[PDB]
Nucleic acid binder design. Structure first.
Ligand SMILES: [K+]
Ligand SMILES: [K+]
Ligand SMILES: [K+]
Ligand SMILES: [K+]
Ligand SMILES: [K+]
Ligand SMILES: [K+]
Ligand SMILES: [K+]
Ligand SMILES: [K+]
Ligand SMILES: [K+]
Ligand SMILES: [K+]
Ligand SMILES: [Mg+2]
Ligand SMILES: [Mg+2]
Ligand SMILES: [Mg+2]
Length: 1322
RNA sequence: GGAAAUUAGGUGCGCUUGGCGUUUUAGAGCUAGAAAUAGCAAGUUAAAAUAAGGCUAGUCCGUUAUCAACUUGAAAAAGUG
DNA sequence: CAATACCAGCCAAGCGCACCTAATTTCC
DNA sequence: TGGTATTG
């Protein structure tokens, strides 16, 4: 028989259904394997496959990086100890052993328990002299006395183990001694430039304000308040913002047309400043130079809070300052709370459970939790003034190892390490020879373009070696081929030219590539004037004239420039009209002008003989990012340019790659003409063919040479784009189809209809940068937590700066419930309910008529406000374009036509691949003309088609009832998809893989299903009972016969819902290391670390369970007792268990294991017990509900309408008349629950909670009935609420009862089963 | 259906790094007590581990993808109603 | 044994390639 | 949601 397949692909489900030509779902009898008395079973061909979400590889990648870094940090300490090895032996032959075994208890230690000196009196004296490592670090930097070689190592090891970041390039030499002299010098250089209006320097404690422990924004406002007759946005105000590390805009200071934003820390500053200085004049050079000088002394003011005159260890001295002020303020807080609050002294300084100082030091209270807990206490008391001040600056009772230590650059640690090495160098000869070696251990960093230092056993590595020997931080340059590695790092990822697959694409900024883009757009421009009869192309001589006169003069060429600078002069046309380009050209010779600024030799860039060398330069500047390697590769061309040009050309760099190769655009040639593709773009007579025309024109050879130059299924899907979560459904969809084909006797279906379904940390950063760019005060006036931005109106409120944007007024946070959320494009036209199409106005009517885009008067009144929000990234350019669409004519007849086509035709590329994959598997033969025979039509639909169909014919959907809706959607997809194609065969082009009239057609396309149709024109249309194809006469829809088939299909209680059994993978257990306890549930973190002494991990993840049938020793006699039980194999144990299952189980305590009866039971293994009650294995000690509550169809659509409430009044009487359905639905739940759920207490608690709210409105009661299905849903028990009664989940921890039940093995469709009566074992 | 360019936004894969946290130990608690306890003192730091571990022994690899059952397969995938 | 209670590693930087969406121009 | 511990 003939049939079709309906498919519904989702991130966690795949619906499927088989239908016949009468739109019926066939029922069959399938063989039942196993050892039960059942030999077959009747099954309908409809169901859904359910599966856990497929995971992305990010978390696995982050963990693989953390593993590499812990291995290399250990190797750094190992490098340092190897250097210290011989000389440390002469001082203390077991010092490094005590450091290694410091974690062990004294019982397990092989050496004395005090690590540093090996005895107690020396150990106590050390901590008295150096309470923190920073005390020792500072002493070793400043003192000249010879120091103990052990203490030297401990200081150097602490700087190498925690070495600080690498975000700043170059050397750093902290020098804060001249902040005062640098500030006055800045105001001195300002006064020589602005002798008209100068600033007075005296009386300004510029050091204190600019080195204060406040924000860079706060320090700026304080300085300007000190300076009379100035402003934060004045020139000197923006200059100070620069020196402090902010990004102020100098555009308004100099009457500039573009922005002049500068930041001293960005590497573009040296060229941004030159861009600005060329705009405003060279006499302002010292002004920005002095701003740079003052910035160097206050650069690390937050990290170094001690003046660098006293010590060469400002970082350590700042940590000692933290310690001393902690000590002083701790003694004061104690004596204070002792005198004024003696009742609470126990809670603050002894209770670890509370967030006091005890929980701050010994408990789990963080610095923030400590401040929040104690701040009310300090206020109540007197004399806590300075401490409340120290608290609000986050500088009270501070530790030295804190979360905010990420500011410290590695140069700072290196400075103290270099100083220690410079002191003890004189006393220890080996520290002299290895001073650079030790410094290298701290500074060395594997470049990202090198990757893992592997030797042929890493699938991630690409590194190439010069010499086959071990790589260390000292021989890295000599052993690693950084050049070959930095090249492979890119060429392993770059695309090949699809036209010539053996060729790599050019760099996006290649000069040849931009000539191509310019000539490809230029060669299709047409111009017309008054005299000529018809618009003509530009000849070859005209295009070179335009490229030489305009494109090689200005960055971007406008038609305005084209009109007024070529035709107006060279042709003298006083009025010409241009065709093929609006406003301006898209292409541009950006690289040409870039190099022209660097070399100034315009003749050299125009000298065509330098084509190859100029391409090699752009390739080097794109291939590499290390400016040292760039210089080395540009050294072969160093003779052609002066040394200053080489210094500029080396810093300039590009990124990005094109889509075409050099050989395609300017290499291969036509046989007859001998011209390459670029040559045709320059001159093609009067045809002026472009790239697409050239490689498709049979007149020349390009089309053939491209055709001349021209993988598993699992591979093919994994290589697609899109989320790995949706990819999981694609592969399962294919596997589901393959089985259905085998079910139907290996006959292929007529049609396959497929359908595919459609944070706060990123939101808070967007708001933060958005307001800060605009400089508004709404964050200061209204501060929000990042989690609170999950409110749609409140998130919009901050995107709109707390201001209505359809009209010019402010908004109030307190009246959020009274505003409106109108969609820019009406939701009827476009199914876009994202932030890109939402808005927060006061009234939806203040938009104008909802027929179109917001009114032209609205756009004209709010145009400037929307461009401000764009430049603050608070709205996207598309959102701005849509809002401003009214000035561009708004929506048209063509615009409105394209929207409803997008509502029915799926255009997503990911959905096309699924259609391409299925079509490739089904249609494989060829006809007489070697054209593919299309046996199976693959139709693609969107959700709105079946969604409207459900809502038009009252085939309503309630997701919470059960999982049947996944399969029902697949059935309706096959029905609607096949009926639409059989009715309108002309639509196969638009629905099968491989203006006003179009709008009216698509908007009424589904009308053929109805009998009485009301149109927007007011026309009431009547259609016959049976529908047919006009040409063929074949019957398509029988409205008196085929609708009844749908309800018969949707009401079928037996549908095949299958949860995909999966072996669990991932982390072994939870990550938290628990303290020592006397339980044996803990897992050792190392082999010899018994958790009873050292603690360990809890909650291991079971990979899968195994049915174990054997004997166990019982009692002191060790008599063998037979057992049958369920053993959970953890992820950690899995490899050893599968290597030798008998020895693994025998080590667990099982003897004489029946090996042939071991059953691998992965998660979600299905069991049937009594009365069809089903359980699913959540683990070895946890069960999930295994039954689906098939609710009758009459209750489903009644639950829909009663919960949701034209003929809305007619459906209301149905709800009111059938108000008795509630006690029937409840009876349905109770009957189902008492049979399969077995939650007696939870059930009568719902029954009691139900009978309490019987006086509630029917709409309100119908909503909470939907919540009750959480009690009966498939899967894990979950807590739900009924009105205000919260009923907790009833869990199934006893897995004993499954060991005597029937194990059900299901195929992917669930049609093929193997049932095993486990009660027959043991 | 597809290509290149332009503008804007987003996802994926991979590499190189920073700072916390946690765990055990070290940092002599004192006095009065038989002792439980009571009173005071003290607290900020370090080492080491950070998936158990593996052989291929690398400054490498170890949490993604893929998996009903049976009969064959190293595996993918095939064969069976 | 079953019910009940509570628990779960986090934050941050830089670099590169590839791909998707939606709008425009020129084309196959 | 599945593990651990307490509770009962
Ligand atoms: K010992
Ligand atoms: K002022
Ligand atoms: K702690
Ligand atoms: K703490
Ligand atoms: K710490
Ligand atoms: K344009
Ligand atoms: K580059
Ligand atoms: K998983
Ligand atoms: K997996
Ligand atoms: K299965
Ligand atoms: Mg780290
Ligand atoms: Mg390790
Ligand atoms: Mg730490």
């Amino acid at each position: 028989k003939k049939y079709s397949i309906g498919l519904d692909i989702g991130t966690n489900s795949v619906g499927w259904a088989v239908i016949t030509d009468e739109y019926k779902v066939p029922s069959k009898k399938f063989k039942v394997l196993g050892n039960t008395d059942r030999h077959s079973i009747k099954k309908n061909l409809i169901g859904a496959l359910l599966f856990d979400s497929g995971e992305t590889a990010e978390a696995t990648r982050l963990k693989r990086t953390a593993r590499r870094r812990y291995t290399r940090r250990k190797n750094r300490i190992c490098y340092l100890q190897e250097i210290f090895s011989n000389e440390m032996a002469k001082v203390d032959d077991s010092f490094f052993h005590r450091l290694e075994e410091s974690f062990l208890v004294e019982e397990d230690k092989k050496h004395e328990r005090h690590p540093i000196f090996g005895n107690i009196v020396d150990e106590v004296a050390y901590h008295e002299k150096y309470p923190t490592i920073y005390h020792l670090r500072k002493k070793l930097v400043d003192s000249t006395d010879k120091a103990d070689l052990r203490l030297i190592y401990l200081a150097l090891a602490h700087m190498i183990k925690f070495r600080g970041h690498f975000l700043i390039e170059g050397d750093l030499n902290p020098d804060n001694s001249d902040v005062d002299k640098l500030f006055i010098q800045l105001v001195q250089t300002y006064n020589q430039l602005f002798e008209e209006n100068p600033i007075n320097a005296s009386g300004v404690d510029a050091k204190a304000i600019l080195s204060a422990r406040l924000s860079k924004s706060r320090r700026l406002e304080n300085l300007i308040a000190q300076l009379p007759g100035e402003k934060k946005n004045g020139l000197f105000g923006n200059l100070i913002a620069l020196s402090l590390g902010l990004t102020p805009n100098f555009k308004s200071n100099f009457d500039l047309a573009e922005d002049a934003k500068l930041q001293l820390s960005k590497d573009t500053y040296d060229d941004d400043l030159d861009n600005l200085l060329a705009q405003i004049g060279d006499q302002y050079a010292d002004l920005f130079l002095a701003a740079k000088n003052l910035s160097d002394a206050i650069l690390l003011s937050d990290i170094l809070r001690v003046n660098t005159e006293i010590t060469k260890a400002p970082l350590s001295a700042s940590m000692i300052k933290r310690y001393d002020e902690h000590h002083q303020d701790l003694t004061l807080l104690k004596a204070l709370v002792r005198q004024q609050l003696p009742e609470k002294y126990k809670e603050i300084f002894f209770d670890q459970s509370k967030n006091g100082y005890a929980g701050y030091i010994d408990g789990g209270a963080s610095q923030e939790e400590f401040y929040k807990f104690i701040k009310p206490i300090l206020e109540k008391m007197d004399g806590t003034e300075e401490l409340l001040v120290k608290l609000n600056r986050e500088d009270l009772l501070r530790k030295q190892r804190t979360f905010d230590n990420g500011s410290i650059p590695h140069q700072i640690h290196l400075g103290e390490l270099h100083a220690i090495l410079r002191r003890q160098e004189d006393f220890y000869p080996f520290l002299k020879d290895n001073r650079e070696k030790i410094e290298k251990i701290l500074t060395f960093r594997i470049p990202y373009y090198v990757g893992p230092l592997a030797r042929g056993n890493s699938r991630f590595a690409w590194m190439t070696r010069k010499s086959e020997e071990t790589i260390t931080p000292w021989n890295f340059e000599e052993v690693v081929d950084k050049g070959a590695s930095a090249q492979s790092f890119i060429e392993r990822m770059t695309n090949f030219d699809k036209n010539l697959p053996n060729e790599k694409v050019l760099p996006k900024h290649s000069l040849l590539y931009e000539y191509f883009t310019v000539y490809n757009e230029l060669t299709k421009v047409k111009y017309v004037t008054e005299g000529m009869r018809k618009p003509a192309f530009l000849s070859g001589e005209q295009k070179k004239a335009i490229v030489d006169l305009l494109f090689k003069t200005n960055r971007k060429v406008t038609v305005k420039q084209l009109k007024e600078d070529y035709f107006k002069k060279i042709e003298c046309f006083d009025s010409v009209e241009i065709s093929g380009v609006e406003d301006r050209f898209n292409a541009s010779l950006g690289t040409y002008h870039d190099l022209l600024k660097i070399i100034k030799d315009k003749d050299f860039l125009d000298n065509e003989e330098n084509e190859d060398i100029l391409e090699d330069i752009v390739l080097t500047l794109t291939l590499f990012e290390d400016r040292e390697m760039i210089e080395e590769r540009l050294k072969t061309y160093a003779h052609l340019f002066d040394d200053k040009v080489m210094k500029q050309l080396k810093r300039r760099r590009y990124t990005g790659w094109g889509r075409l190769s050099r050989k395609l655009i300017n290499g291969i040639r036509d046989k007859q003409s001998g011209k390459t593709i670029l040559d045709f773009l320059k001159s093609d007579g009067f045809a002026n063919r472009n790239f697409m025309q050239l490689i498709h024109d049979d007149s020349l050879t390009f089309k053939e040479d491209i055709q001349k130059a021209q993988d598993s299924l699992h591979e093919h899907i994994a290589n697609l784009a899109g989320s790995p979560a949706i990819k999981k459904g694609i592969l399962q969809t294919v596997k589901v189809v393959d089985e259905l084909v085998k079910v139907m006797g290996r006959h292929k279906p007529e049609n396959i209809v497929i359908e595919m379904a459609r944070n706060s940390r990123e939101r808070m950063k967007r708001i933060e940068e958005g307001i800060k760019e605009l400089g508004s005060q709404i964050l200061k006036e209204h501060p929000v937590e990042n989690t609170q931005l999950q409110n749609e109106k409140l998130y919009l409120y901050y995107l709109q700066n707390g201001r209505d944007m359809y009209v010019d007024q402010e908004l109030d946070i307190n009246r959020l419930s009274d505003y409106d959320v109108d969609h820019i494009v009406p939701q009827s036209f476009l199914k876009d309910d994202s932030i890109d199409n939402k808005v927060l106005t006061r009234s939806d009517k203040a938009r104008g008529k909802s027929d179109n885009v917001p009114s032209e008067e609205v756009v004209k009144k709010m145009k400037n406000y929307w461009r401000q929000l764009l430049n603050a990234k608070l709205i996207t350019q598309r959102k701005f374009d849509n809002l401003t669409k009214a000035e561009r004519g708004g929506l048209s007849e063509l615009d409105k036509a394209g929207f409803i086509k997008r509502q029915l035709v799926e255009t997503r590329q990911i959905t096309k691949h699924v259609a391409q994959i299925l079509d490739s598997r089904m249609n494989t033969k060829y006809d007489e003309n070697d054209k593919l025979i299309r046996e199976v039509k693959v139709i693609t639909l969107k959700s709105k088609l079946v969604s409207d169909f459900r809502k038009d014919f009252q085939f309503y959907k309630v997701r919470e009832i059960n999982n049947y809706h996944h399969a029902h959607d697949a059935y309706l997809n096959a029905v609607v998809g096949t009926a639409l194609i059989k009715k309108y065969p002309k639509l196969e082009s638009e629905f099968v893989y491989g203006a006003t009239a179009k709008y009216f057609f698509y908007s009424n396309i589904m009308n053929f299903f109805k009998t009485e149709i009301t149109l927007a024109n007011g026309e009431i249309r009547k259609r016959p009972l049976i529908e047919t194809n006009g040409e063929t006469g074949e019957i398509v829809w029988d409205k008196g016969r085929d609708f009844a088939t749908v309800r018969k299909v949707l009401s079928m209680p037996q549908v095949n819902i299958v949860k995909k059994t999966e072996v669990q993978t991932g982390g072994f257990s939870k990550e938290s290391i628990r303290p020592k306890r006397n339980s044996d549930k803990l897992i050792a973190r190392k082999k010899d670390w018994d958790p009873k002494k050292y603690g360990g991990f809890v909650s291991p993840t079971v990979a899968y369970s195994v049915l174990v049938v054997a004997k166990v020793e019982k009692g002191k006699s060790k008599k063998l007792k037979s057992v049958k039980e369920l053993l959970g194999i953890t992820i950690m144990e899995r490899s050893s268990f599968e290597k030798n299952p008998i020895d693994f189980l025998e080590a667990k305590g099982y003897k004489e294991v029946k090996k042939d009866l071991i059953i691998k039971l992965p998660k979600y293994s299905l069991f049937e017990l009594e009365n069809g009650r089903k359980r699913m294995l959540a683990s070895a000690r946890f069960l999930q509900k295994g039954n689906e509550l098939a609710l009758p169809s009459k209750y489903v659509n009644f639950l829909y309408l009663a919960s949701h409430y034209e003929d809305n009044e007619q459906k209301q009487l149905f709800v009111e008349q059938h108000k008795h359905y509630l006690d029937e639905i409840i009876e349905q739940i109770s009957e189902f629950s008492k049979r399969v759920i077995l939650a007696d207490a939870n059930l009568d608690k719902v029954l009691s909670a139900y009978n309490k709210h019987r006086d509630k409105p029917i709409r309100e009661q119908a909503e909470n009935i939907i919540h009750l299905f959480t009690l009966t849903n498939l899967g894990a028990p979950r807590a739900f609420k009924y009105f205000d009664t919260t009923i907790d989940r009833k869990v199934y921890r006893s897995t004993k009862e499954v060991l005597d039940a029937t194990l059900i093995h299901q195929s992917i469709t669930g049609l093929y089963e193997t049932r095993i009566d486990l009660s027959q074992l043991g």
